Amino acid sequence: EKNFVITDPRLPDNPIIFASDGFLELTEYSREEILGRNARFLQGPETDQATVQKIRDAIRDQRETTVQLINYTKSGKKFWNLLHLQPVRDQKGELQYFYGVQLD
Amino acid sequence: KNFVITDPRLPDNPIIFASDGFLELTEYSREEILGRNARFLQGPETDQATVQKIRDAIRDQRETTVQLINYTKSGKKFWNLLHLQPVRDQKGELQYFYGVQLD
Ligand SMILES: Cc1cc2nc3c(=O)[nH]c(=O)nc-3n(C[C@H](O)[C@H](O)[C@H](O)COP(=O)(O)O)c2cc1C
Ligand SMILES: Cc1cc2nc3c(=O)[nH]c(=O)nc-3n(C[C@H](O)[C@H](O)[C@H](O)COP(=O)(O)O)c2cc1C
């Protein structure tokens, strides 16, 4: 019910810079293993890239979106991910972060 | 999905991040919120014994869950089920707290 991450689109490859304990438990990764990496590590071969394209379009356009996609825990167990994404911009109107909430 | 991040390495443990849900719940804008300690949500009917629990939990750097009166920007009373969680790095350094607000 409380699974979320913050990413930094200002750093190369838009890596995760924060994850809740819920996200860690959901995905089986530790904070050490996750931070500094783009969340795409949760994807795998059975993930539909057309569905990821919607995420891509939202990030480019810098707008919120919500999509369902196949995701893999560290061990390769699949987990339910209804992903909600939201951009955050600073006072000068420049994109600052994205936050993402994983519903399961 | 109402949540905030604070930075306890910064003076008075101020909010450095707030979700849109938190903004809508409290009626504040992000500009009005960042750099401030979350206590501005408190007011006259906020149980001071409950604030002491949050106080001790932050002191000991442990997670906690409490229920207390908060006030929106317009002064509107609301009950806040607040969940706090500290985050530290691999070298043991306390880095953030995150909090999640249920109303
Ligand atoms: C805040 C945020 C959270 C994200 N969470 C997930 C996630 O939980 N699972 C996932 O498969 N992709 C997630 N993504 C998507 C990837 O990070 C990336 O945007 C997507 O794979 C498209 O980028 P790419 O084409 O370079 O791989 C998230 C993206 C952002 C910005
Ligand atoms: C991450 C985080 C989120 C918090 N959210 C709230 C909140 O939503 N409402 C509230 O009344 N206090 C909240 N607090 C508690 C206050 O910031 C403060 O710690 C509390 O009032 C006790 O400190 P004080 O005695 O110095 O005021 C939060 C604290 C942290 C660390």
Side-chain angles (χ1 to χ4, degrees):
Chain A
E1 101 225 33
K2 54 192 195 268
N3 312 320
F4 70 90
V5 299
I6 313 285
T7 69
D8 199 342
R10 307 166 298 175
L11 286 176
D13 211 37
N14 185 28
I16 294 161
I17 66 174
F18 189 103
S20 70
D21 285 0
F23 178 90
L24 299 194
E25 195 184 327
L26 174 73
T27 65
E28 305 172 13
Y29 291 96
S30 69
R31 209 164 259 113
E32 303 91 278
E33 296 162 339
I34 288 180
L35 299 177
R37 301 169 64 189
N38 185 285
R40 78 172 60 85
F41 62 81
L42 292 175
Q43 296 165 27
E46 303 188 355
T47 306
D48 186 6
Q49 276 308 318
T51 307
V52 183
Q53 189 56 50
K54 302 185 191 286
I55 288 177
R56 221 164 265 126
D57 292 337
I59 287 177
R60 194 195 49 197
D61 291 334
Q62 306 179 12
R63 63 179 162 80
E64 88 173 74
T65 198
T66 307
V67 298
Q68 298 188 316
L69 76 170
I70 316 291
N71 267 191
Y72 294 66
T73 64
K74 181 223 284 180
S75 67
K77 280 204 286 190
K78 282 97 165 212
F79 69 91
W80 288 0
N81 192 359
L82 178 53
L83 175 71
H84 176 73
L85 301 175
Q86 188 71 250
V88 175
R89 72 184 67 256
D90 63 32
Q91 271 74 291
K92 285 190 137 268
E94 288 298 321
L95 177 64
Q96 196 170 350
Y97 310 103
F98 282 105
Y99 70 88
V101 172
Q102 293 85 12
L103 296 339
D104 86 325
Chain B
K1 47 190 183 306
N2 311 322
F3 66 89
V4 305
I5 315 291
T6 63
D7 196 335
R9 296 168 290 175
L10 302 179
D12 202 26
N13 193 21
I15 297 165
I16 66 170
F17 191 99
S19 70
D20 286 4
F22 182 83
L23 300 193
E24 186 157 347
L25 168 75
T26 67
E27 307 172 5
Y28 288 91
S29 63
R30 200 165 269 108
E31 307 87 85
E32 293 166 325
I33 283 340
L34 302 177
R36 289 173 83 195
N37 184 292
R39 68 176 66 89
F40 62 83
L41 293 166
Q42 304 169 4
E45 297 191 28
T46 308
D47 191 354
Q48 278 308 301
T50 304
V51 185
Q52 179 62 53
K53 292 196 180 316
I54 298 174
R55 205 171 295 133
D56 295 343
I58 292 186
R59 191 203 56 210
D60 301 322
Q61 302 173 13
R62 64 191 213 268
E63 73 162 284
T64 185
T65 296
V66 299
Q67 262 199 323
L68 80 172
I69 292 296
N70 280 171
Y71 293 83
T72 69
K73 195 190 175 190
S74 62
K76 177 187 299 166
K77 271 178 49 174
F78 71 98
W79 281 94
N80 180 7
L81 177 61
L82 170 73
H83 170 70
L84 301 180
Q85 185 65 255
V87 184
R88 70 182 76 253
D89 60 19
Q90 346 126 253
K91 292 181 160 160
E93 178 219 309
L94 175 66
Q95 219 130 86
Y96 312 106
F97 284 97
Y98 70 86
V100 169
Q101 296 78 18
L102 291 104
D103 55 308

